[PDB]
Write an enzyme that holds these catalytic residues in place. Structure first.
Site, PDB file in Angstrom:
ATOM      1  N   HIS A  68      18.636 -62.771 -61.643  1.00 49.34           N
ATOM      2  CA  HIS A  68      17.883 -62.962 -60.398  1.00 49.34           C
ATOM      3  C   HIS A  68      18.685 -63.629 -59.284  1.00 49.34           C
ATOM      4  O   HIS A  68      18.234 -63.628 -58.128  1.00 49.34           O
ATOM      5  CB  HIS A  68      16.554 -63.714 -60.626  1.00 49.34           C
ATOM      6  CG  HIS A  68      16.689 -65.074 -61.244  1.00 49.34           C
ATOM      7  ND1 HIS A  68      16.608 -65.283 -62.604  1.00 49.34           N
ATOM      8  CD2 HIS A  68      16.848 -66.301 -60.686  1.00 49.34           C
ATOM      9  CE1 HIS A  68      16.747 -66.572 -62.860  1.00 49.34           C
ATOM     10  NE2 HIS A  68      16.892 -67.211 -61.713  1.00 49.34           N
ATOM     11  N   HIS A  98      22.854 -71.969 -55.934  1.00 46.60           N
ATOM     12  CA  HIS A  98      22.640 -70.532 -55.920  1.00 46.60           C
ATOM     13  C   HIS A  98      22.181 -70.160 -54.514  1.00 46.60           C
ATOM     14  O   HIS A  98      21.893 -71.026 -53.676  1.00 46.60           O
ATOM     15  CB  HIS A  98      21.605 -70.108 -56.967  1.00 46.60           C
ATOM     16  CG  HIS A  98      20.272 -70.710 -56.712  1.00 46.60           C
ATOM     17  ND1 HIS A  98      19.894 -71.938 -57.200  1.00 46.60           N
ATOM     18  CD2 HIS A  98      19.245 -70.287 -55.923  1.00 46.60           C
ATOM     19  CE1 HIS A  98      18.682 -72.232 -56.747  1.00 46.60           C
ATOM     20  NE2 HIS A  98      18.262 -71.250 -55.959  1.00 46.60           N
ATOM     21  N   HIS A 100      19.759 -67.078 -52.130  1.00 43.40           N
ATOM     22  CA  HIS A 100      18.811 -65.981 -51.988  1.00 43.40           C
ATOM     23  C   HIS A 100      19.250 -65.192 -50.763  1.00 43.40           C
ATOM     24  O   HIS A 100      19.681 -65.781 -49.765  1.00 43.40           O
ATOM     25  CB  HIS A 100      17.391 -66.512 -51.778  1.00 43.40           C
ATOM     26  CG  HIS A 100      16.957 -67.488 -52.838  1.00 43.40           C
ATOM     27  ND1 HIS A 100      16.189 -67.132 -53.926  1.00 43.40           N
ATOM     28  CD2 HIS A 100      17.182 -68.820 -52.970  1.00 43.40           C
ATOM     29  CE1 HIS A 100      15.963 -68.204 -54.675  1.00 43.40           C
ATOM     30  NE2 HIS A 100      16.567 -69.241 -54.129  1.00 43.40           N
ATOM     31  N   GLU A 110      14.388 -67.920 -47.636  1.00 40.55           N
ATOM     32  CA  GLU A 110      13.084 -68.277 -48.198  1.00 40.55           C
ATOM     33  C   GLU A 110      12.310 -69.126 -47.198  1.00 40.55           C
ATOM     34  O   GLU A 110      11.230 -68.734 -46.747  1.00 40.55           O
ATOM     35  CB  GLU A 110      13.298 -68.965 -49.542  1.00 40.55           C
ATOM     36  CG  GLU A 110      13.883 -67.985 -50.543  1.00 40.55           C
ATOM     37  CD  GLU A 110      13.666 -68.379 -51.968  1.00 40.55           C
ATOM     38  OE1 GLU A 110      13.896 -69.565 -52.289  1.00 40.55           O
ATOM     39  OE2 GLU A 110      13.266 -67.504 -52.767  1.00 40.55           O
ATOM     40  N   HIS A 123      20.808 -72.965 -51.949  1.00 44.96           N
ATOM     41  CA  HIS A 123      20.081 -74.064 -52.575  1.00 44.96           C
ATOM     42  C   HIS A 123      21.005 -74.830 -53.500  1.00 44.96           C
ATOM     43  O   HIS A 123      21.477 -74.279 -54.501  1.00 44.96           O
ATOM     44  CB  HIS A 123      18.902 -73.526 -53.389  1.00 44.96           C
ATOM     45  CG  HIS A 123      17.832 -72.963 -52.533  1.00 44.96           C
ATOM     46  ND1 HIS A 123      16.864 -72.090 -52.992  1.00 44.96           N
ATOM     47  CD2 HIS A 123      17.594 -73.159 -51.217  1.00 44.96           C
ATOM     48  CE1 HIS A 123      16.067 -71.798 -51.978  1.00 44.96           C
ATOM     49  NE2 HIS A 123      16.489 -72.422 -50.896  1.00 44.96           N
ATOM     50  N   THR A 202      11.527 -72.213 -56.184  1.00 47.61           N
ATOM     51  CA  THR A 202      11.019 -70.957 -55.641  1.00 47.61           C
ATOM     52  C   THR A 202      11.121 -69.792 -56.620  1.00 47.61           C
ATOM     53  O   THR A 202      10.767 -68.666 -56.260  1.00 47.61           O
ATOM     54  CB  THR A 202      11.711 -70.592 -54.330  1.00 47.61           C
ATOM     55  OG1 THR A 202      13.048 -70.236 -54.629  1.00 47.61           O
ATOM     56  CG2 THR A 202      11.638 -71.729 -53.326  1.00 47.61           C
ATOM     57  N   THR A 203      11.582 -70.042 -57.843  1.00 48.10           N
ATOM     58  CA  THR A 203      11.564 -69.059 -58.916  1.00 48.10           C
ATOM     59  C   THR A 203      10.731 -69.574 -60.070  1.00 48.10           C
ATOM     60  O   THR A 203      10.681 -70.791 -60.297  1.00 48.10           O
ATOM     61  CB  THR A 203      12.977 -68.807 -59.435  1.00 48.10           C
ATOM     62  OG1 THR A 203      13.613 -70.059 -59.724  1.00 48.10           O
ATOM     63  CG2 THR A 203      13.772 -68.063 -58.393  1.00 48.10           C
TER      64      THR A 203
HETATM   65 HG   LIG Z   1      16.264 -63.781 -64.162  1.00 48.94          HG
HETATM   66 ZN   LIG Z   2      16.634 -71.188 -54.787  1.00 43.86          ZN
END
Ligand SMILES: [Hg+2]
Ligand SMILES: [Zn+2]
Ligand SMILES: O=C1OC[C@@H]2CNCCN12
Ligand SMILES: [Hg+2]
Length: 264
Positions: A68, A98, A100, A110, A123, A202-203
Protein backbone atom coordinates in the site's frame (compact mmCIF):
# COMPACT_ATOMS: atom_id res chain seq x y z
CA UNK A 1 -5.77 -10.45 -8.96
CA UNK A 2 -7.27 -7.87 -6.58
CA UNK A 3 -10.35 -9.10 -4.68
CA UNK A 4 -10.68 -12.40 -6.60
CA UNK A 5 -9.00 -14.94 -4.30
CA UNK A 6 -9.91 -12.94 -1.20
CA UNK A 7 -10.69 -9.49 0.11
CA UNK A 8 -8.18 -7.08 1.59
CA UNK A 9 -8.35 -3.36 2.23
CA UNK A 10 -6.76 -1.21 -0.43
CA UNK A 11 -7.40 1.76 -2.70
CA UNK A 12 -9.55 0.23 -5.47
CA UNK A 13 -13.22 0.32 -6.37
CA UNK A 14 -14.11 -2.67 -4.23
CA UNK A 15 -11.79 -2.20 -1.25
CA UNK A 16 -10.94 1.50 -1.03
CA UNK A 17 -11.51 4.04 1.74
CA UNK A 18 -15.32 4.03 1.49
CA UNK A 19 -15.29 0.29 2.33
CA UNK A 20 -12.81 0.26 5.22
CA UNK A 21 -15.47 0.68 7.93
CA UNK A 22 -16.71 -2.85 7.17
CA UNK A 23 -13.58 -4.35 8.72
CA UNK A 24 -12.36 -1.38 10.81
CA UNK A 25 -15.43 0.27 12.36
CA UNK A 26 -13.28 3.08 13.83
CA UNK A 27 -13.17 4.43 10.27
CA UNK A 28 -16.36 6.29 11.30
CA UNK A 29 -14.86 7.43 14.61
CA UNK A 30 -14.55 10.81 16.28
CA UNK A 31 -10.91 11.63 15.48
CA UNK A 32 -10.21 10.25 12.02
CA UNK A 33 -7.60 11.60 9.63
CA UNK A 34 -6.91 13.21 7.27
CA UNK A 35 -8.96 16.41 7.43
CA UNK A 36 -9.29 19.57 5.39
CA UNK A 37 -7.36 22.40 7.03
CA UNK A 38 -9.53 25.51 6.68
CA UNK A 39 -7.04 28.35 7.01
CA UNK A 40 -9.76 30.83 8.07
CA UNK A 41 -10.83 28.62 11.00
CA UNK A 42 -7.48 27.46 12.43
CA UNK A 43 -6.37 29.84 15.16
CA UNK A 44 -2.83 30.91 16.03
CA UNK A 45 -1.91 29.53 19.45
CA UNK A 46 0.91 31.56 21.05
CA UNK A 47 1.42 28.83 23.66
CA UNK A 48 2.65 26.36 21.00
CA UNK A 49 6.38 25.92 20.79
CA UNK A 50 8.74 25.72 17.83
CA UNK A 51 9.06 22.20 16.50
CA UNK A 52 12.33 20.57 17.58
CA UNK A 53 13.54 18.12 14.92
CA UNK A 54 16.62 16.20 16.11
CA UNK A 55 17.44 13.90 13.19
CA UNK A 56 21.26 14.28 13.28
CA UNK A 57 21.79 10.72 14.57
CA UNK A 58 19.09 8.96 12.55
CA UNK A 59 19.79 5.37 11.51
CA UNK A 60 17.74 4.15 8.56
CA UNK A 61 17.75 0.40 8.03
CA UNK A 62 15.52 -0.94 5.24
CA UNK A 63 12.93 0.13 2.69
CA UNK A 64 9.84 -2.05 2.21
CA UNK A 65 7.01 -2.16 -0.35
CA UNK A 66 4.14 -3.27 1.90
CA UNK A 67 1.51 -3.41 -0.87
CA UNK A 68 0.00 0.00 0.00
CA UNK A 69 3.08 2.28 0.10
CA UNK A 70 6.78 2.00 0.82
CA UNK A 71 8.20 2.48 4.31
CA UNK A 72 11.70 3.73 5.08
CA UNK A 73 12.41 2.17 8.46
CA UNK A 74 14.59 3.45 11.28
CA UNK A 75 16.35 2.05 14.33
CA UNK A 76 14.12 3.25 17.19
CA UNK A 77 15.93 1.38 20.02
CA UNK A 78 17.33 4.73 21.28
CA UNK A 79 16.58 8.46 20.98
CA UNK A 80 18.47 8.72 17.67
CA UNK A 81 15.85 10.66 15.70
CA UNK A 82 13.29 12.48 17.79
CA UNK A 83 10.53 15.04 17.47
CA UNK A 84 9.95 17.37 20.44
CA UNK A 85 8.30 20.71 21.13
CA UNK A 86 5.19 22.28 19.68
CA UNK A 87 2.05 20.60 20.99
CA UNK A 88 4.09 17.63 22.15
CA UNK A 89 4.81 16.67 25.74
CA UNK A 90 8.03 14.69 25.94
CA UNK A 91 9.93 12.88 23.24
CA UNK A 92 8.69 11.03 20.16
CA UNK A 93 11.00 8.65 18.28
CA UNK A 94 11.00 8.23 14.52
CA UNK A 95 10.09 4.68 13.46
CA UNK A 96 9.36 5.05 9.73
CA UNK A 97 8.34 7.40 6.98
CA UNK A 98 6.18 6.81 3.92
CA UNK A 99 4.27 8.78 1.31
CA UNK A 100 0.82 8.94 -0.26
CA UNK A 101 0.55 10.09 -3.87
CA UNK A 102 -1.70 10.39 -6.87
CA UNK A 103 -2.04 9.12 -10.41
CA UNK A 104 -1.72 12.75 -11.60
CA UNK A 105 -0.27 15.90 -10.10
CA UNK A 106 -3.66 17.38 -9.07
CA UNK A 107 -4.28 14.82 -6.34
CA UNK A 108 -2.36 12.61 -3.94
CA UNK A 109 -2.25 14.38 -0.60
CA UNK A 110 -4.40 13.24 2.32
CA UNK A 111 -4.67 16.51 4.18
CA UNK A 112 -5.92 19.41 2.10
CA UNK A 113 -5.50 23.15 2.70
CA UNK A 114 -8.59 25.19 1.85
CA UNK A 115 -9.61 22.14 -0.22
CA UNK A 116 -6.33 22.20 -2.18
CA UNK A 117 -4.90 18.75 -2.93
CA UNK A 118 -1.14 18.48 -3.30
CA UNK A 119 0.59 15.91 -5.53
CA UNK A 120 1.74 13.84 -2.55
CA UNK A 121 2.20 13.87 1.21
CA UNK A 122 5.10 12.59 3.34
CA UNK A 123 4.38 11.13 6.80
CA UNK A 124 7.18 10.79 9.35
CA UNK A 125 5.76 8.55 12.06
CA UNK A 126 6.99 8.82 15.66
CA UNK A 127 5.99 7.16 18.95
CA UNK A 128 5.90 8.61 22.46
CA UNK A 129 8.78 7.18 24.47
CA UNK A 130 6.76 7.24 27.70
CA UNK A 131 4.98 4.11 26.39
CA UNK A 132 8.15 2.13 25.71
CA UNK A 133 7.35 0.64 22.26
CA UNK A 134 5.22 1.45 19.21
CA UNK A 135 2.73 -1.32 20.01
CA UNK A 136 1.94 0.09 23.44
CA UNK A 137 1.96 3.66 22.12
CA UNK A 138 -0.90 2.76 19.73
CA UNK A 139 -3.10 2.00 22.73
CA UNK A 140 -2.91 5.62 23.90
CA UNK A 141 -4.56 8.88 22.80
CA UNK A 142 -1.14 10.63 22.78
CA UNK A 143 0.85 7.66 21.54
CA UNK A 144 2.03 8.93 18.14
CA UNK A 145 3.13 12.13 16.43
CA UNK A 146 3.10 12.30 12.64
CA UNK A 147 4.95 15.09 10.83
CA UNK A 148 3.14 15.63 7.54
CA UNK A 149 4.78 17.43 4.63
CA UNK A 150 3.11 18.28 1.33
CA UNK A 151 4.81 17.68 -2.01
CA UNK A 152 4.23 19.84 -5.09
CA UNK A 153 5.73 19.23 -8.53
CA UNK A 154 8.39 21.74 -9.54
CA UNK A 155 12.13 21.63 -8.98
CA UNK A 156 13.72 18.37 -7.85
CA UNK A 157 14.36 17.58 -4.18
CA UNK A 158 17.99 16.35 -4.07
CA UNK A 159 17.52 14.61 -0.72
CA UNK A 160 14.70 12.52 -2.18
CA UNK A 161 16.73 11.11 -5.07
CA UNK A 162 18.23 8.19 -3.12
CA UNK A 163 14.68 7.06 -2.33
CA UNK A 164 13.59 7.44 -5.97
CA UNK A 165 16.54 5.42 -7.22
CA UNK A 166 15.94 2.41 -4.93
CA UNK A 167 12.28 1.97 -5.90
CA UNK A 168 13.16 -0.22 -8.90
CA UNK A 169 14.46 -2.82 -6.45
CA UNK A 170 11.22 -2.91 -4.40
CA UNK A 171 8.75 -2.76 -7.26
CA UNK A 172 6.27 -5.29 -5.89
CA UNK A 173 4.49 -6.05 -2.64
CA UNK A 174 6.67 -7.72 -0.04
CA UNK A 175 10.03 -6.68 -1.50
CA UNK A 176 12.46 -5.04 0.91
CA UNK A 177 16.02 -3.83 0.52
CA UNK A 178 18.83 -2.45 2.62
CA UNK A 179 18.53 1.31 2.93
CA UNK A 180 21.15 2.62 5.35
CA UNK A 181 22.51 6.12 5.90
CA UNK A 182 19.43 7.92 4.62
CA UNK A 183 19.14 11.39 6.13
CA UNK A 184 15.50 12.50 6.53
CA UNK A 185 16.57 16.13 7.02
CA UNK A 186 16.82 16.18 3.21
CA UNK A 187 13.02 15.94 3.03
CA UNK A 188 12.18 19.06 5.07
CA UNK A 189 11.09 22.46 3.71
CA UNK A 190 12.74 25.67 4.90
CA UNK A 191 10.05 26.69 7.40
CA UNK A 192 8.72 24.58 10.24
CA UNK A 193 5.47 26.60 10.52
CA UNK A 194 2.68 24.08 11.14
CA UNK A 195 -0.90 23.25 11.93
CA UNK A 196 -1.75 20.68 14.60
CA UNK A 197 -4.81 18.66 15.58
CA UNK A 198 -5.64 15.28 17.18
CA UNK A 199 -6.35 12.47 14.73
CA UNK A 200 -5.54 9.00 13.53
CA UNK A 201 -3.30 7.04 11.23
CA UNK A 202 -4.80 7.13 7.73
CA UNK A 203 -4.46 3.41 6.91
CA UNK A 204 -6.18 0.47 8.61
CA UNK A 205 -6.34 -0.14 11.47
CA UNK A 206 -6.93 3.67 11.55
CA UNK A 207 -5.71 3.98 15.12
CA UNK A 208 -6.82 7.17 16.89
CA UNK A 209 -3.49 7.85 18.57
CA UNK A 210 -1.91 10.66 16.55
CA UNK A 211 -0.98 14.25 17.23
CA UNK A 212 -0.75 15.59 13.68
CA UNK A 213 1.85 18.26 12.87
CA UNK A 214 1.29 19.35 9.25
CA UNK A 215 3.85 21.76 7.83
CA UNK A 216 2.50 24.75 5.94
CA UNK A 217 5.34 24.96 3.40
CA UNK A 218 5.37 22.18 0.77
CA UNK A 219 8.55 20.67 -0.55
CA UNK A 220 9.10 20.69 -4.30
CA UNK A 221 9.89 17.46 -6.14
CA UNK A 222 10.37 17.03 -9.86
CA UNK A 223 7.90 15.43 -12.23
CA UNK A 224 10.45 12.69 -12.86
CA UNK A 225 10.71 11.95 -9.12
CA UNK A 226 6.96 11.53 -8.64
CA UNK A 227 6.66 9.54 -11.89
CA UNK A 228 9.03 6.99 -10.36
CA UNK A 229 6.71 6.65 -7.34
CA UNK A 230 3.94 5.87 -9.85
CA UNK A 231 5.92 2.94 -11.31
CA UNK A 232 5.67 0.98 -8.07
CA UNK A 233 3.17 -1.88 -7.92
CA UNK A 234 0.45 -2.80 -5.43
CA UNK A 235 0.63 -6.42 -6.61
CA UNK A 236 3.21 -9.04 -5.76
CA UNK A 237 5.85 -10.41 -8.11
CA UNK A 238 4.41 -12.72 -10.74
CA UNK A 239 0.92 -11.20 -10.45
CA UNK A 240 -0.61 -8.83 -13.01
CA UNK A 241 0.56 -5.24 -12.77
CA UNK A 242 -1.57 -2.80 -10.76
CA UNK A 243 0.25 0.50 -10.45
CA UNK A 244 0.68 1.90 -6.93
CA UNK A 245 -1.08 5.24 -7.41
CA UNK A 246 -3.86 7.06 -5.57
CA UNK A 247 -2.95 5.49 -2.22
CA UNK A 248 -4.55 8.37 -0.30
CA UNK A 249 -7.56 8.54 1.98
CA UNK A 250 -9.79 11.61 1.45
CA UNK A 251 -10.64 14.14 4.13
CA UNK A 252 -12.78 12.93 7.02
CA UNK A 253 -15.24 14.80 9.26
CA UNK A 254 -13.57 17.22 11.65
CA UNK A 255 -16.31 16.85 14.27
CA UNK A 256 -15.50 18.89 17.41
CA UNK A 257 -11.78 19.15 16.81
CA UNK A 258 -9.67 22.30 16.78
CA UNK A 259 -6.83 22.93 14.35
CA UNK A 260 -4.18 25.22 15.83
CA UNK A 261 -1.57 27.20 13.91
CA UNK A 262 1.97 27.75 15.16
CA UNK A 263 2.24 31.01 13.21
CA UNK A 264 0.40 34.30 13.49
HG1 LIG B 1 -0.90 -3.28 2.43
ZN1 LIG C 1 0.52 8.05 5.97
O1 LIG D 1 -3.86 29.09 9.09
C1 LIG D 1 -4.12 30.27 9.05
O2 LIG D 1 -4.19 30.95 7.89
C2 LIG D 1 -4.61 32.32 8.14
C3 LIG D 1 -4.63 32.48 9.66
C4 LIG D 1 -3.52 33.37 10.27
N1 LIG D 1 -3.36 33.09 11.70
C5 LIG D 1 -2.99 31.70 11.94
C6 LIG D 1 -4.11 30.80 11.49
N2 LIG D 1 -4.42 31.08 10.08
HG1 LIG E 1 12.87 -0.78 14.40
Amino acid sequence: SPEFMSHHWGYGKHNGPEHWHKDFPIAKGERQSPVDIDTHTAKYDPSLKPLSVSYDQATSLRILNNGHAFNVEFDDSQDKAVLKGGPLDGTYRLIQFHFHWGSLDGQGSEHTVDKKKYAAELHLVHWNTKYGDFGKAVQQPDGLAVLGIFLKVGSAKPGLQKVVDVLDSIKTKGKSADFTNFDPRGLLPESLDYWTYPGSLTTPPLLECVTWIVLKEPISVSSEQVLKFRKLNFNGEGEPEELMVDNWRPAQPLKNRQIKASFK
